[PDB]
Design a protein around this ligand. Sequence first.
Ligand SMILES: [Fe+2]
Ligand SMILES: [Fe+2]
Length: 244
Amino acid sequence: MNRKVVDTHVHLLLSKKQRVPDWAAIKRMLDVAKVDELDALCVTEHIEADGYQTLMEGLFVENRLPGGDQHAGRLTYQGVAIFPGAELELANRTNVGVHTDLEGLLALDRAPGAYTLERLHAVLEQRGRPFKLVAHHIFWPGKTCDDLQALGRYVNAIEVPAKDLANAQNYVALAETLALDTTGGSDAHTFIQVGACRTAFELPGSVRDCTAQDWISSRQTSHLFTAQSPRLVVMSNIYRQSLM
Ligand SMILES: [Fe+2]
Ligand SMILES: [Fe+2]
């Protein structure tokens, strides 16, 4: 088998109240992704973010990322691919990672809680375009699910979140119960946390760069962390506290 590693949950905006992408801060995050030997990053920015539209067009449309490289509609930074995505807050207040082509992502309702899981799935199924849905940090307080039965119908993977690794067993056990794949995502909002949990998957055929579509279509995915992962999350928290 051949193997890619991707942080499937990354925020390139520090907060949803940020108007303009801070390119210097983004660069810090990609530098760390390079050091930490990630193959790719999924930008699951909060769709309701003030700066979501500017961020997404800036990255993938207006090619405005300093140091960014765009070949055949694929955005790399020093070899590290950058895949478009969105994090949505659903009607029951859970979070889902949405991985699809940029056209779809820009066409979704952006109001917090605008979709149920059922409707999100229907609307994406309605398009004739590949997509992947990931249940984010499903045991996190304020983000728990009242219907884990329906989750299994509509979602493709359970995320093992970097920020909740002390409880990783629960996420793995839930994925097993539902016969779903797992992902690892960091939910990094700063350079410090990127890659703290990551996703491994096999790409069929010859060694090549992973595309967004290759990730979307991948199955049998799993998560990866280290004993030093929790520390990344704590240091990222201290850093955010210092900025206030
Ligand atoms: Fe956030
Ligand atoms: Fe997130």
